[PDB]
Amino acid sequence: ARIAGINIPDHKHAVIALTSIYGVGKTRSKAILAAAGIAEDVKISELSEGQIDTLRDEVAKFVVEGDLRREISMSIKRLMDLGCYRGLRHRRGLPVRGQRTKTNARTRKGPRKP
């Protein structure tokens, strides 16, 4: 099952096995299995060519895994060439969405740099 990238998930319920691939999560998984008419309590055992390519076509109706990555990259390049406040915080590693820079921003700032 070389679908959507390198992931061959196995022995999972498909409702989580579709979250297992980058760029696709829970609600998208539920909608894909509804559009393919697949029960939630199935396993990846006994899977066929139809059960590959119907899933891949229904997810190829969606933005996945390569162009999403370079879309994030192109948004970041657009903000850096913009030189906005948010672009400056993206380029210098500071929390963008209205946080406090003073205390406890270590997800964005990394570990403590003395």
Partner: protein, 177 residues
């Protein structure tokens, strides 16, 4: 045999009509294809190279060949004449088989693909490229991984210029941004 014959008719006539050479032996043909894997972190684990050689003899059909360390350097803490890396040379029928099973079924399983680069030629008509993952070849069971060991490919041809080699590979898919 397939892409060999595909060359033998279409690429021969295509390149000859492109560059209007004096003769057919003056056309670029692919001469050999070599494959390298630098196993260097096996300075301690002696069988890391042994299993990497099994991996390359699963990718290729033929048994590989180890490489001797040319001259000792302290920059990489190696001794001269050390079990240091493994290569496979390919000519002829297995070479065309490897190119077939490369360009059909391996390039699109590269992680998050976009087309290959342009300036990757030597200048005298050769090509080389390096991979990151290694289940891009089908001969690797996914439950057999033990490192993220990549490898690099060299297509050595008689292209008298890199632009001639570019037009040689434009007869193939050869993604080409």
């Amino acid at each position: 045999a397939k892409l060999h014959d595909y060359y033998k008719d279409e690429v021969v006539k295509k390149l000859m009509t492109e560059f209007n050479y004096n003769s057919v032996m003056q056309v670029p043909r692919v001469e050999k294809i070599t494959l390298n894997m630098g196993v260097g972190e096996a300075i301690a684990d002696k069988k890391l190279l042994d299993n990497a050689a099994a991996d390359l003899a699963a990718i290729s059909g033929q048994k590989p060949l180890i490489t001797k360390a040319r001259k000792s350097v302290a920059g990489f803490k190696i001794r001269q004449g050390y079990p240091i890396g493994c290569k496979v040379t390919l000519r002829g029928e297995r070479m065309w088989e490897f190119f077939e099973r490369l360009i059909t079924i391996a390039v699109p399983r590269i992680r998050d693909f976009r087309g290959l680069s342009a300036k990757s030629f030597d200048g005298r008509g050769n090509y080389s490229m390096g991979v990151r993952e290694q289940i891009i070849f089908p001969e690797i069971d996914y439950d057999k991984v033990d490192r993220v060991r990549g490898l690099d490919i060299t297509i050595t041809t008689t292209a008298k210029s890199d632009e001639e080699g570019r037009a040689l590979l434009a007869a193939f898919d050869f993604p080409f941004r």
